[PDB]
Amino acid sequence: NMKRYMGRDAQRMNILAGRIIAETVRSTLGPKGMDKMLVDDLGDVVVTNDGVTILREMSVEHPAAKMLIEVAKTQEKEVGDGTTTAVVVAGELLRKAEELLDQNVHPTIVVKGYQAAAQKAQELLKTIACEVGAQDKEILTKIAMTSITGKGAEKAKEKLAEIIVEAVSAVVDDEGKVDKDLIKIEKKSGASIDDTELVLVDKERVSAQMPKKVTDAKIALLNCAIEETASEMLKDMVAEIKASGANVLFCQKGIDDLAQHYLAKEGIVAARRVKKSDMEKLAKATGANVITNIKDLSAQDLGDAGLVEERKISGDSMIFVEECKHPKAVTMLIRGTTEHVIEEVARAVDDAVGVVGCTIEDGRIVSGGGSTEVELSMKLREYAEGISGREQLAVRAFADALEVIPRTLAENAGLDAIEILVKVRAAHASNGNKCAGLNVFTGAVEDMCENGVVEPLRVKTQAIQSAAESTEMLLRIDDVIAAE
Amino acid sequence: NMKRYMGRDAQRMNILAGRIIAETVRSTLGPKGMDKMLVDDLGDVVVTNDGVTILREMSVEHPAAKMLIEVAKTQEKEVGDGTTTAVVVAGELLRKAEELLDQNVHPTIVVKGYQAAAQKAQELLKTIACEVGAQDKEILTKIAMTSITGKGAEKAKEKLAEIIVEAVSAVVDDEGKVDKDLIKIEKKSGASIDDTELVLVDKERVSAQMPKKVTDAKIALLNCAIEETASEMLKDMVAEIKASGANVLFCQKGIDDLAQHYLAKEGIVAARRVKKSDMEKLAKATGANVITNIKDLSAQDLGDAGLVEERKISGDSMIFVEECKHPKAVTMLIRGTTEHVIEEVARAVDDAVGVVGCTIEDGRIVSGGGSTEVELSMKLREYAEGISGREQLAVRAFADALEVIPRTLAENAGLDAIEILVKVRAAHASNGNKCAGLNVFTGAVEDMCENGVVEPLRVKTQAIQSAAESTEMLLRIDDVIAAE
Numbered sequence: 001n002m003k004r005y006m007g008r009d010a011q012r013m014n015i016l017a018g019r020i021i022a023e024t025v026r027s028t029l030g031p032k033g034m035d036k037m038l039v040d041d042l043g044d045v046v047v048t049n050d051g052v053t054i055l056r057e058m059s060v061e062h063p064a065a066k067m068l069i070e071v072a073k074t075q076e077k078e079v080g081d082g083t084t085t086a087v088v089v090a091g092e093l094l095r096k097a098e099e100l101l102d103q104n105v106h107p108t109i110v111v112k113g114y115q116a117a118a119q120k121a122q123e124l125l126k127t128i129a130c131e132v133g134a135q136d137k138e139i140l141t142k143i144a145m146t147s148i149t150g151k152g153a154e155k156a157k158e159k160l161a162e163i164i165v166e167a168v169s170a171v172v173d174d175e176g177k178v179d180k181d182l183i184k185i186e187k188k189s190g191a192s193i194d195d196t197e198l199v200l201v202d203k204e205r206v207s208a209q210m211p212k213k214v215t216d217a218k219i220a221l222l223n224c225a226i227e228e229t230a231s232e233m234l235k236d237m238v239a240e241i242k243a244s245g246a247n248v249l250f251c252q253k254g255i256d257d258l259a260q261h262y263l264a265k266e267g268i269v270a271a272r273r274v275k276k277s278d279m280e281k282l283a284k285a286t287g288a289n290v291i292t293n294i295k296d297l298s299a300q301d302l303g304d305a306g307l308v309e310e311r312k313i314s315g316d317s318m319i320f321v322e323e324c325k326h327p328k329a330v331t332m333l334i335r336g337t338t339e340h341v342i343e344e345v346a347r348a349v350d351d352a353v354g355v356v357g358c359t360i361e362d363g364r365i366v367s368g369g370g371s372t373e374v375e376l377s378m379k380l381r382e383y384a385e386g387i388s389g390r391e392q393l394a395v396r397a398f399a400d401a402l403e404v405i406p407r408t409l410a411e412n413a414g415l416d417a418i419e420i421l422v423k424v425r426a427a428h429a430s431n432g433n434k435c436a437g438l439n440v441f442t443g444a445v446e447d448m449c450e451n452g453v454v455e456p457l458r459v460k461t462q463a464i465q466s467a468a469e470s471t472e473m474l475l476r477i478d479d480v481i482a483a484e
Numbered sequence: 485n486m487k488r489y490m491g492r493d494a495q496r497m498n499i500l501a502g503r504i505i506a507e508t509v510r511s512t513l514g515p516k517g518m519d520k521m522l523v524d525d526l527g528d529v530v531v532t533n534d535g536v537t538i539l540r541e542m543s544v545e546h547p548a549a550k551m552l553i554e555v556a557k558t559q560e561k562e563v564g565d566g567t568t569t570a571v572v573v574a575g576e577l578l579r580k581a582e583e584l585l586d587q588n589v590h591p592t593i594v595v596k597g598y599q600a601a602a603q604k605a606q607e608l609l610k611t612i613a614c615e616v617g618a619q620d621k622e623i624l625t626k627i628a629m630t631s632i633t634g635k636g637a638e639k640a641k642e643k644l645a646e647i648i649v650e651a652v653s654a655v656v657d658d659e660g661k662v663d664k665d666l667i668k669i670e671k672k673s674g675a676s677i678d679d680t681e682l683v684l685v686d687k688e689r690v691s692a693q694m695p696k697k698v699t700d701a702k703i704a705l706l707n708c709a710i711e712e713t714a715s716e717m718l719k720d721m722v723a724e725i726k727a728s729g730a731n732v733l734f735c736q737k738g739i740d741d742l743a744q745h746y747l748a749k750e751g752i753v754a755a756r757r758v759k760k761s762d763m764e765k766l767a768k769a770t771g772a773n774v775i776t777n778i779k780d781l782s783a784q785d786l787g788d789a790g791l792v793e794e795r796k797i798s799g800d801s802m803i804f805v806e807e808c809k810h811p812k813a814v815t816m817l818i819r820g821t822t823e824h825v826i827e828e829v830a831r832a833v834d835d836a837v838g839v840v841g842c843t844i845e846d847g848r849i850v851s852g853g854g855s856t857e858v859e860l861s862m863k864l865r866e867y868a869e870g871i872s873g874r875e876q877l878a879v880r881a882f883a884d885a886l887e888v889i890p891r892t893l894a895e896n897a898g899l900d901a902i903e904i905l906v907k908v909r910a911a912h913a914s915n916g917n918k919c920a921g922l923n924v925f926t927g928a929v930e931d932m933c934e935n936g937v938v939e940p941l942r943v944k945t946q947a948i949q950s951a952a953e954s955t956e957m958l959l960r961i962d963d964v965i966a967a968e
């Protein structure tokens with residue numbers, strides 16, 4: 001009772017389960033990559049190329065397959081971009097492992113070489129990484145351009161990348177990290193995509209008596225109700241909010257009609273029945289605390305916004321909580337034709353903000369298009385030469401597994417994956433180039449540094465470490481116990 | 485009509501047929517190699533380790549398998565030793581080929597790299613080959629010792645190798661080739677193996693009147709009968725033999741009683757009804773011509789032997805046709821307990837004569853025990869690095885196939901074939917040793933030059949060229965037509 005596989009039947013069962021879900025997202029990789037349509041139980045339709053969004057919301061039930069959905073989940077959490085690359089590598093590390101397992105090479109000798117090679121791979125990517133001065137805006141534009149590319153070439157327009165860099169360099173708290181929460185994202189309609197210019201609550205003001213737009217507003221987020229009868233029992237409740245010094249008031253519950261007069265009598269603007277999702281947004285953006293008791297409302301529990309304005313944007317009158325000047329907080333009015341386009345243009349900026357923010361924090365970038373994958377592969381095979389024992393073959397299989405990304409890039413491009421794999425490999429020997437990679441549009445092998453195809457070092461370093469540590473643990477299983 | 489396989493079903497059918505007969509002789513290789521027992525239709529039993537004798541006399545019927553029995557057949561014809569090694573390599577070249585065929589790499593790109601690598605392998609073995617002065621007898625003893633070893637360590641005794649070298653160095657016709665036919669092989673009984681001292685016709689003299697042993701005898705080989713009635717019609721026939729000047733007469737047919745008196749009257753010794761097999765032996769050893777007419781018997785059709793003597797060796801009185809002094813022809817009295825032992829001690833010398841004769845003619849030897857196989861493998865992988873295109877992978881597969889012999893040597897030894905394959909490979913890098921190989925008795929990797937494990941260059945160069953040319957032709961078949 002109830003389900004168990006023995007030794008060889010357990011090792012092959014776990015390796016096959018990791019490889020089968022890896023091939024599902026193997027075609028999505030590359031500028032000429034494929035998209036996936038997922039239809040669940042509800043009949044809800046969604047089409048996505050992003051590797052992490054596919055694995056999370058689709059029906060997966062195999063025990064070994066569920067463990068590999070933690071690699072991409074910690075890839076989007078730590079980096080964001082490179083969720084597809086982190087899964088495919090892990091699949092190839094299982095393919096090169098079972099080739100050694102059938103030859104009676106012990107799994108512990110395999111895990112001995114796999115860890116030692118991954119320990120060396122991290123201390124080899126450091127040299128081949130180029131240093132990008134934190135405010136070198138011409139390179140930062142290229143890094144942002146490389147991030148928008150991959151989701152679409154038509155999305156990658158010269159003017160869009162210039163806007164993103166200006167926002168990230170402004171929100172840097174000297175010295176000198178980058179907080180991604182400081183940039184506010186707004187999703188509005190209107191014939192745009194190009195009209196995109198450098199929290200939005202779907203509500204109005206509780207009374208027409210209240211004014212419309214402050215400068216340097218203090219926002220009190222109340223979870224508790226400000227309620228009553230007919231005997232001015234709210235004059236205390238209104239004065240308690242005035243005691244803290246908050247001119248803006250976001251209430252999650254209902255505000256009574258008597259309190260509406262008194263809050264407007266002071267000059268304080270209030271909003272009734274704001275969605276619970278929007279209340280959690282306001283607390284983290286402005287730096288506010290959600291208070292569930294009006295008696296204990298403190299002045300240090302209030303958030304700080306730059307510009308609060310009830311604009312009638314796209315017809316609807318909504319509360320524009322953003323804003324600043326010499327600004328530590330920036331708002332991005334991401335706009336497009338249909339809401340489904342807007343959300344995609346919103347997620348495209350999410351990756352573009354991350355890479356520029358990572359470049360400022362680190363300094364660091366590596367050549368994309370399967371360029372640094374070849375350089376690291378040839379440097380680890382010569383590293384394997386100086387290792388005595390059976391653990392050498394594990395390092396050799398680790399290095400031969402690194403050539404999967406440049407191989408799969410040709411698989412989805414149209415060109416032969418066997419011919420180019422030799423052309424780039426020969427163009428890495430001795431010295432040059434280190435930056436030589438495959439350009440899917442041109443066809444021939446080109447220098448990626450001059451093409452503008454660059455990705456942050458964290459995209460490659462995290463993806464290797466997350467895939468290595470996962471495959472090391474998966475090769476340490478010989479018995480599977482699955483009840484029910 | 486009648487049998488045909490299409491494309492992929494034809495290529496896999498021919499590769500599998502070559503590999504299946506390669507595994508049959510794969511266990512025979514090495515000092516700790518296995519023997520094979522073959523029972524045919526007649527019920528005749530014979531046990532042999534020699535790779536070429538197995539493939540020739542056993543029941544083989546597959547069309548693709550019969551073509552690979554021409555490699556070892558031309559290995560024993562050209563070299564002698566290394567018939568097993570020539571087949572196993574050809575099998576691995578088919579295994580590494582079908583790995584490329586499943587990846588849609590075209591067979592002509594495979595044959596392009598396989599030929600170019602074999603062309604380089606021949607011009608890389610020339611440097612790693614050591615020059616052995618033709619009369620350097622201390623090394624020639626080691627080469628002879630290495631030849632006797634492989635068939636048996638108990639066969640390999642110090643005194644035996646010293647005897648062989650003296651015979652080969654004497655039969656050298658200056659300057660300066662070695663004729664293997666000049667050394668006569670005799671198979672006699674008696675408690676020996678150690679009593680082996682540095683044509684034998686199973687017949688006597690036709691008349692007791694005839695003498696027994698000449699010096700510098702001229703031998704007339706007659707196929708025609710010297711026959712008669714009762715009216716001295718043989719006085720012409722006897723005088724016609726005397727006209728040529730031959731004191732020794734070997735007759736294949738019957739000699740009549742009247743001619744027996746007249747031949748003995750002259751002093752000419754004759755023998756009646758010598759086996760047809762022995763007549764062909766006498767013609768090639770002494771340098772004689774088989775004449776089928778007594779009227780045309782010429783003096784230039786007579787052979788020349790050193791010593792002809794009717795010894796009563798081992799009880800039986802047989803004609804000892806050998807012999808010399810300052811000798812261009814040498815006789816080896818190979819002796820043992822049972823006739824089946826004698827024949828094996830006779831075949832063990834056959835390999836020992838070849839290698840010493842090849843060393844005098846060439847100069848040349850390479851380290852055995854899978855030593856030069858590793859050196860050539862690492863030198864062709866770096867040679868593959870400087871080749872652009874898909875033909876590189878064919879050279880890589882050609883070089884990776886060379887490590888089969890050192891791998892199979894460990895397979896039959898008892899030690900791990902995965903662990904040692906790394907130990908020797910790492911001990912070949914940069915410079916040293918070139919002569920590093922596996923010693924099956926010691927276990928650890930040792931220098932083969934100091935151990936005395938050396939083989940002629942022709943053993944390795946012929947085996948590669950015979951296996952490469954065969955596998956190149958076999959990869960050029962896509963349709964099989966087999967009628968009946």
Ligand SMILES: Nc1ncnc2c1ncn2[C@@H]1O[C@H](COP(=O)(O)OP(=O)(O)OP(O)(O)=S)[C@@H](O)[C@H]1O
Pocket residue numbers: 028029030031033049050051080081082083084085086146149150151367368369370438439440453454455
């Ligand atoms: N113009 C280009 N030429 C060649 N390679 C490129 C180019 N633009 C991007 N790349 C490479 O393509 C890969 C990115 O492909 P994507 O399909 O976006 O997958 P990912 O970034 O691994 O994961 P996502 O984006 O989170 S789904 C990286 O390895 C880039 O270096």
Ligand SMILES: Nc1ncnc2c1ncn2[C@@H]1O[C@H](COP(=O)(O)OP(=O)(O)OP(O)(O)=S)[C@@H](O)[C@H]1O
Pocket residue numbers: 512513514515517533534535564565566567568569570630633634635851852853854922923924937938939
């Ligand atoms: N003492 C030794 N230590 C290591 N290798 C050895 C030793 N003696 C011989 N060898 C190697 O063993 C191989 C010879 O093995 P064998 O089984 O005799 O097969 P073969 O010579 O290929 O074919 P035969 O003799 O014609 S059957 C050669 O590659 C030798 O260099």
